[PDB]
């Protein structure tokens, strides 16, 4: 069923998904953020952030100096609530609200100010729609790698299973007295190197003043010994 006009009241669940989404996508991808919410648009998610959820916003009780400044700015800049708000470093709706309280909707109505209203609490039984919304949000918030990296993951797993199947068949043949070599990877180009056939690009240590013959013999003997073994047995002052 389509949804042509989005909006309504902001539930707590939506505010929490929006905050998690902002922590991942930043503040310039409101369409990607809103994509995690079923009933809210990109512009409404941006408004909910800029006017209510952004932690930098000053919602504290107005000081007497701020009350005087508010009345003055309201007289100097008539009806220019966003300019006044910018001067007060407070949300525009908070300033209008305070100004009204300092001068002293209905069922089926559209709320024009919904993005600045307090969040409707999640009652303990989450509706299925919101439960599915949370599941989809957790799934999209988890992903971090693109198609190529993901295919490389599955390809490495398949390459390992092929490797084990190859060794299984080779071991069955060996146990039956049929010795067979393991398949070498096919060359992708004329100069494709087989790194075991030689010490590729060998850089022998620079000769020094000290003789190494007696330790070279020892290393050679140890290398021979190791390889034969593998062949036989395997492996409070803060103040303003």
């Amino acid at each position: 069923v389509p949804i042509y006009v989005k909006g309504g009241v902001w539930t707590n669940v939506e505010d929490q998904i929006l905050k998690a989404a902002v922590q991942k996508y930043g503040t310039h991808q409101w369409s990607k953020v809103a994509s995690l919410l079923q009933k809210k648009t990109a512009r409404q998610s941006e408004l909910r952030w800029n006017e209510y959820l952004n932690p930098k916003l000053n919602f504290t009780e107005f000081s007497k100096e701020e009350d005087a400044q508010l009345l003055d700015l309201a007289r100097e800049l008539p009806n220019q609530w966003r300019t006044i708000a910018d001067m007060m470093a407070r949300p525009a709706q908070v300033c209008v609200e305070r100004y009204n309280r300092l001068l002293e909707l209905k069922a089926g109505d559209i709320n024009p100010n919904a993005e600045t209203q307090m969040a409707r609490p999640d009652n303990g039984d989450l509706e299925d729609e919101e439960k599915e919304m949370l599941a989809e949000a957790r799934a999209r918030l988890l992903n971090t790698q693109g198609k190529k990296a993901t295919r490389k993951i599955r390809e490495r797993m398949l390459e390992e299973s092929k490797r084990i199947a190859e060794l299984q068949k080779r071991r069955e043949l060996k146990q039956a007295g049929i010795n067979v070599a393991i398949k070498k990877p096919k060359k992708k180009y004329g100069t494709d190197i087989d790194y075991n056939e030689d010490i590729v690009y060998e850089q022998a240590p620079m000769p020094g003043i000290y003789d190494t013959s007696t330790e070279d013999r020892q290393i050679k003997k140890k290398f021979e010994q190791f390889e034969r073994k593998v062949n036989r047995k395997g492996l409070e002052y803060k103040k303003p």
């Binding site: 998690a20 902002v22 922590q23 991942k24 952004n54 932690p55 918030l141 790698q145």
Partner: peptide, 11 residues
Amino acid sequence: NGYTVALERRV
């Protein structure tokens, strides 16, 4: 990397 950082670090 698709990391998640505190809102203060994004804003």
